[PDB]
Amino acid sequence: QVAVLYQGVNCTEVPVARVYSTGSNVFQTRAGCLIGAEH
Amino acid sequence: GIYQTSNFRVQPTESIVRFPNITNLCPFGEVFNATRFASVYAWNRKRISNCVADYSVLYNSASFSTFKCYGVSPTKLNDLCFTNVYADSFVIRGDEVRQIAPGQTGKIADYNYKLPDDFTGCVIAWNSNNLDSKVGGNYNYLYRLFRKSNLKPFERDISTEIYQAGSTPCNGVEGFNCYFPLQSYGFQPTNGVGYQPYRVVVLSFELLHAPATVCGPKKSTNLVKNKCVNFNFNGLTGTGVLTESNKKFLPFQQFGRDIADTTDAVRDPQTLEILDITPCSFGGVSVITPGTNTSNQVAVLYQGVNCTEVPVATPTWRVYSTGSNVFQTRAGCLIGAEHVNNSYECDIPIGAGICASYQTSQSIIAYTMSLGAENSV
Amino acid sequence: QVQLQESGGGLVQAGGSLRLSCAASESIFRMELMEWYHQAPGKQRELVATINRCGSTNYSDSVKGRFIISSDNAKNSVYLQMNSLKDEDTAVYSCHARTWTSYWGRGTQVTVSS
Amino acid sequence: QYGSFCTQLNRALTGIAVEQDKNTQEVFAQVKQIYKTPPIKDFGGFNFSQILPDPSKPSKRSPIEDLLFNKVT
Amino acid sequence: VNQNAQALNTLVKQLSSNFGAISSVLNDILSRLDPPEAEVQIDRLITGRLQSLQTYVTQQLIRAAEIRASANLAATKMSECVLGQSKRVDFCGKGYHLM
Amino acid sequence: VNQNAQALNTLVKQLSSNFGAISSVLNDILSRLDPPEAEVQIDRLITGRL
Amino acid sequence: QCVNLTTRTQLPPAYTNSFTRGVYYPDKVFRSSVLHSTQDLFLPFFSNVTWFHAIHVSGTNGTKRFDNPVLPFNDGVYFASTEKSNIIRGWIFGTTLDSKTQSLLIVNNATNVVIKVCEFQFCNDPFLGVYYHKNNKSWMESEFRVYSSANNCTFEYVSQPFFKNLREFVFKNIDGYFKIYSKHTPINLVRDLPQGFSALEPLVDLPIGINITRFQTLLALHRSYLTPGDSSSGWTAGAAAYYVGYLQPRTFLLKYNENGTITDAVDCALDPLSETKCTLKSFTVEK
Ligand SMILES: *[C@@H]1O[C@H](CO)[C@@H](O[C@@H]2O[C@H](CO)[C@@H](O)[C@H](O)[C@H]2NC(C)=O)[C@H](O)[C@H]1NC(C)=O
Ligand SMILES: *[C@@H]1O[C@H](CO)[C@@H](O)[C@H](O)[C@H]1NC(C)=O
Ligand SMILES: *[C@@H]1O[C@H](CO)[C@@H](O)[C@H](O)[C@H]1NC(C)=O
Ligand SMILES: *[C@@H]1O[C@H](CO)[C@@H](O)[C@H](O)[C@H]1NC(C)=O
Ligand SMILES: *[C@@H]1O[C@H](CO)[C@@H](O)[C@H](O)[C@H]1NC(C)=O
Ligand SMILES: *[C@@H]1O[C@H](CO)[C@@H](O)[C@H](O)[C@H]1NC(C)=O
Ligand SMILES: *[C@@H]1O[C@H](CO)[C@@H](O)[C@H](O)[C@H]1NC(C)=O
Ligand SMILES: *[C@@H]1O[C@H](CO)[C@@H](O)[C@H](O)[C@H]1NC(C)=O
Ligand SMILES: *[C@@H]1O[C@H](CO)[C@@H](O)[C@H](O)[C@H]1NC(C)=O
Ligand SMILES: *[C@@H]1O[C@H](CO)[C@@H](O)[C@H](O)[C@H]1NC(C)=O
Ligand SMILES: *[C@@H]1O[C@H](CO)[C@@H](O)[C@H](O)[C@H]1NC(C)=O
C-alpha cells in the first residue's frame, strides 16, 4: 500500500489532473492533496 | 616530491579484419540499366541483399550527372557493411532534381517523394534524353500535382481518385474543381535541358544492429588472440585484447554490453564463436625524484598496471631498461629503485604503505613506512 | 460514480435464500482482492469471504457449507449467495476491495426473522 | 583548440586526492610512539577484550572492528 | 560510498548521448564520413562531454570540501574527548563525559 | 599566494585559444570579414571565453 | 474450394487476464545481472484479453460451431493457444482479405507449414477439414478449404514435410518488416492461461512490406460439413481455445540474470509503486 501526495494544489482539480478513482479519503493538508491515508 | 607527468598506453600491434562468407554480386546492372523507369508517384522498390557490391565502379563510372551522398562519404562506402539495400527509381525533369534532398519543400517533395530528415543514403541522377525522350513525346510518365496532404517519408500513393478542389463533390467524375489525378510529362527533345529526362535512383542503407548481407569488397584475416589488436567485425571497429569468453550467447544475439556503452563481447561472423573484448592497457606515468639540488637520478612509477607488459608499454626509456628490481606494488611497478627491509619515517609517499627516499645500488630506495619508534609501558 | 455499489439487502425469514451482489465500475480483475464484511450490532466488523486474484477462496468458520462467494466475468461484479439463514447472520454487510488503496461500499442491511 | 582546459581539471582532481590523505593523517597520526598493553589483564575487574586487539584473528582487529568492517560493503 | 559510486556511474552513462550529433560513438562517425563534416559532429560531441566533465568536477570539489569539514571536526574530537577530559557538555556524548 | 597567481595566469593565458574560430584576435577577424560570418566567429569566441 | 458452415448459434464472449505474460527481448544483444529499462510495444500488465473457444459449443451434447471472427490488428496482436490436439493451424493477415490487395498466408498443415504472400480470394469460412474418424480406419486426413484463387505470389516459404500446451505468439508490423516471437511450455488443468513469467524470443524477421489492418484464424475442421457423425463433433467440447491481446506503447524495466535470460520486469505506468520502482531503478524501495 502506498499514498500519493500532490504538491500545493487544492483537492478539487486532482480528479481531472493510475486513476484517482473518485473521492475516497481525499483529506486535504497545507502541503497539498493527500490520497490514501486516514486522518 | 612526486609529480604526474603524462600517461602511457599499449600501442596496437596488429589489425585484423573478419567479414561474412558471402560471395555473390549485387545486381546494380539491373536497376541502373533498366530500359523503362517508373512514374514519379509510383516509383519502384528493389531490395538488395546477400551479395558483395563494388561502389567504386559506380562512383567512377562518370556516366552519372549527380552523385551526392547523405550521412556517408561515397569514398568509404566500400569499407562499410549494411543489413540490406533498398533501391528506387523514376524519371524527373532536370529542374526538379533538387527536390529529392530531405528537409526541402517541393511539389515532387511534398506529393511524390518525401525523404525523412534523418535519411542515410545517396541519390543518383543522370540525364536520359537519348533514352526516355521521344520525338512525339514520352507521355507514359505521370505527374501528380494535387493531394489532400503531404505524404509521409518513404510512402507510395497509387489512388487515382479525382480530388475535389472546391465544395462540389467530384464523385469520381471530372469537371469544375475536378482534375486528372496524374498529369502527363511532355518529354520531347525539343524541350530544354532543364526539361530533359533525368533518371533518378535513390539508395537507402539500413545501419541497424543485425547480420549484414551487402558487405563491400574486402578480405578476411585470421584471428590472433591474447594481444592488443585492431579488430573490425562486420563493420564495427575497435582496439583491444580478445580472449575466450564463457558467456552463453543466445542464438539470436550478436553483441554483449554490461554498462550499456561498451561492447564487451562479440561473435565472429564466419566462425560462430563468442569472444570477449578488453581494452589493452593504460595508466599514468609518475616520476619520483629528490630535489635537483640533491642529484639527477629519478625513478618512474607506472600506476595501476602489471609491469610484465611495461617493457612493451625517440625517448623510449623502456624495453632495454631492465633496472635492477622491477618489483610489483599495489600501486603498480617501481622502476629505478631498490627494495630495502629497514623501515623509516615516510618523506615521499607512494601508496599502500610504500615510501621512497634518497640516501647513500641505485640511489633511490623504497621501503615500507614505519609508524614510529616502538615503546612499552 | 460510486466506484463500488452493493445490492441485495433486505428482510428475510430464517432458512431462506439470498444473493448479495456488489458491483464495481473498475475491472474486478486488476483489483487483486474481493472481500465481504458484515458487522453485527453491538459487535465489531468481521470478515466473511475472501477471493484473491489467483482464485484462492476462503470462508469464515460460521460461513462454510452455506455461503459461497463467486464472481462472474461477464458483468464485472462479485456474487455471494446466502442460504439456510440463521438469526445471528443478521448484520450490515459490506464488500471490501483493495487494489492499492482501501475501497468500501454501503447498504445491504440483512435481517433474519426468527 | 580549446586551450588548456584539461590541466585545471587534472590539477583539481589531484588536489582532492592529496586532501584525502591529508585528512587521514591529521585525524589519526596523533601519537608519536606505539604502545602495547601488558599481557596481564588485571584491571580491577574491568574487561576490555571487546575493544582490545584480537591476535587470534588474521587481521589484528577488535571484534567491534570486525562487525563494522563487515557492515559496510 | 553510494553517492560517490552513483556520481561515477552517472558520469559513465553520459557517454551514450548524442548531444545533437548523428551517433554517440566516435569511431563510427570517423569511419563513415569525411573531415569537412567529421569535425562538424566532433565539435558537438566534444562540447557535450566537456560540459559533463565540468559538472562532475565541480560537484566532486564541493563534496570534498564538506568531507574535509567533517574530518576536521573528527580530528578535534580525537584530540579532546579521547586524550583528556573535556568539560564541554554534549561534545563527547550525552551526560557528563568520563573518557 | 601561488594558487591565486597561477589561477590568474591561467585565466589570462586562455585569451590565445581559437575555440574553433579562424583566429584568436577580435580586430583581425573584424578587419577581414563582413558582418554575416564575423558574427559566427565572434559567437564562437564569446562562448569559449564565457 | 470453400464450403459453408451449418450450425452457428451464439455464446457471449468471455474474458480473462494476462498477468505478467507476453514479454519479448527488445533487441538482439547480451546482458548479465543488470536490470535495464526499455521502451517498446508490450502487452500491458493485467490486461483484459478476449477469449474464444475453438469449438463454439452451444451444448456439450454435440451442438458445435467455430469461433473465428475477423479481428482488428492495431499496433500488434498477442496470440497464444492452449490445446491438446493441434486445432490451430495458421492465420491470414491483411486489410480486406480479398484478391484486390495482397495478403499474407501462413498455415500449418499435416505435411508442412506454408508461408505465402499472394492476392488470395478468401471465402467467408476458410478452414482445414479433418477426417480423423471420417474414414474406416483411424488416421489423420486433412483438407484445404482456405481460399478459392491465389494471384501474385510475391513471397513463398515452406517447411520440410512432417497434456495441454501453450504456444505464445507476438506479431508486429513495422518498417515493412514482420516479427514473430514464440515460446513452448507444457501445462495442465488450465481453463485460462496460468500465471507465471516467460520470455518470448524472436523466431523470424520477414520483409513483406505490405499493409495489415485486420486478421483472422485458421482452424481444424475435426468434423465434416454435410454429416459429421453421431455427436460431439468438436474435440472435448470447445476445450481447445486461444486468446487475443492488444499491445500498447509502454515503458518497461527488464531484469537480466547472470545467464542473460530475462527473469522479471515491471510496468512503469500501472501503479505508483511501479513508478517509484522505475524511478529508483530497483526492485525494492525503502521507507
Ligand atoms: C572479558 O569478556 C569476554 C566476553 O566479552 C569473556 O570471554 C568469555 O569467556 C567465557 C568464559 O571464559 C566464555 O564462556 C565466553 O564465550 C567468552 N565470550 C567471548 C565473547 O569470547 C572474557 O572471559 C572476559 N575476561 C575477563 C578477564 O573478564
Ligand atoms: C480550495 O477551494 C475552496 C473553494 O472555496 C477554498 O475555500 C479553499 O480555501 C481552497 N484551498 C486552498 C488551499 O486554496
Ligand atoms: C477529532 O475529534 C474532533 C472532536 O474533538 C472531531 O470533530 C474530529 O472529527 C476528530 N478527528 C478525526 C480524524 O476523527
Ligand atoms: C564459407 O565457409 C566454409 C566453412 O565455414 C568454407 O569452407 C568456405 O570456403 C567459405 N566460403 C568462402 C568463399 O571462403
Ligand atoms: C549496361 O550493361 C552494359 C553491358 O551489359 C555495361 O557495359 C554498362 O556499363 C551497363 N550500364 C551501366 C550504366 O553501367
Ligand atoms: C641548493 O644548492 C646550493 C648550491 O649547492 C646550496 O647552497 C643550497 O643550500 C641548496 N639548497 C638546499 C635547500 O639544500
Ligand atoms: C599480473 O601480475 C600478477 C601478480 O600480482 C601475476 O600473478 C600475473 O601472472 C600477471 N599477469 C600477467 C598477464 O603477466
Ligand atoms: C628482507 O629479509 C628477508 C629475510 O628475512 C628476505 O627474504 C627479503 O628478501 C629481504 N628484503 C629486502 C628488501 O631486503
Ligand atoms: C473487462 O472484462 C470484463 C469481463 O470480466 C468485462 O465485464 C469488462 O467490461 C471488461 N472491461 C473492459 C474495459 O474491457
Ligand atoms: C497479379 O496477377 C494478375 C493475373 O493473375 C494480374 O492481372 C495483375 O496485374 C497482377 N498484379 C500484380 C501487382 O502483380
Ligand atoms: C492500410 O490500409 C488502410 C485501409 O484499410 C488504409 O487506410 C491505410 O492508409 C493503409 N496503411 C498504409 C501504411 O498504407
Short mmCIF file of N, CA and C in Angstrom, two decimals, chain G residues 25 60 175 179 224 264-265:
data_model
loop_
_atom_site.label_atom_id
_atom_site.label_comp_id
_atom_site.label_asym_id
_atom_site.label_seq_id
_atom_site.Cartn_x
_atom_site.Cartn_y
_atom_site.Cartn_z
N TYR G 25 12.25 -10.14 -25.93
CA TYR G 25 13.51 -9.41 -25.94
C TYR G 25 13.44 -8.28 -26.96
N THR G 60 -22.94 -29.42 -24.70
CA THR G 60 -21.95 -30.50 -24.73
C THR G 60 -22.46 -31.74 -25.44
N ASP G 175 8.02 -0.82 -40.27
CA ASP G 175 9.03 -0.58 -41.31
C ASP G 175 8.97 -1.62 -42.42
N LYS G 179 7.49 -9.39 -37.53
CA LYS G 179 8.25 -10.01 -36.45
C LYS G 179 7.40 -11.06 -35.76
N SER G 224 -17.17 -33.07 -40.46
CA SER G 224 -17.46 -32.78 -41.85
C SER G 224 -18.52 -31.68 -41.91
N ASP G 264 12.54 -11.04 -14.55
CA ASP G 264 11.41 -10.29 -14.04
C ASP G 264 11.44 -8.88 -14.60
N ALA G 265 10.27 -8.25 -14.62
CA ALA G 265 10.13 -6.90 -15.13
C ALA G 265 8.89 -6.27 -14.52
#
